[PDB]
Design a protein around this ligand. Structure first.
Ligand SMILES: OCc1ccc2ncccc2c1
Length: 145
């Protein structure tokens, strides 16, 4: 299977699914490197972020666990189609790139924080990550190119 995938078993349904330990994505279907990729992201900061502040809040006080719960809720609505990634990023991302619907532009290896970079380059074009942890906080990453 493609870089970083493994089989797993649903605890609730017993049905097999697939999980990527680089991007933290999970899916039911069996899944099937460039100089640069283009990604958007939605960042949720927490009280141990490297800079716990953003355009949304002068003092970000939420815990890491609380930030993960927010991230998980956003992923759920994106995957159900109730909301779009671009819409949630514009409204709730703690990165100034919120004003660009989360778009970071194109980048090479070496420029971003390593867990972010590895998830970005392991996604297929159009793919979304699960929660990705860095010193900035927790991200949802969408590879657009
Ligand atoms: O934080 C890096 C970054 C990248 C892209 C951006 N685009 C628009 C506004 C702010 C932006 C910030």
């Amino acid at each position: 299977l493609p870089p970083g995938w493994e089989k797993a078993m649903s605890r609730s349904s017993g049905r097999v699914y697939y999980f990527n330990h680089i991007t933290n994505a999970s899916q039911w279907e069996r899944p099937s490197e460039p100089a640069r990729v283009r990604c958007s992201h939605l960042l949720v900061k927490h009280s141990q972020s490297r800079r716990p502040s953003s355009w949304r809040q002068e003092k970000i006080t939420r815990t890491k666990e609380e930030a993960l719960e927010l991230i998980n809720g956003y992923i759920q609505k994106i995957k159900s189609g109730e909301e779009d990634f671009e819409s949630l990023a514009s409204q709730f991302s703690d990165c100034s790139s919120a004003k660009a619907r989360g778009d970071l532009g194109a980048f090479s290896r070496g420029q971003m924080q390593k867990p972010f970079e590895d998830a970005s380059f392991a996604l297929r074009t159009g793919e979304m990550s699960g929660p990705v942890f860095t010193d900035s906080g927790i991200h949802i990453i969408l590879r657009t190119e």
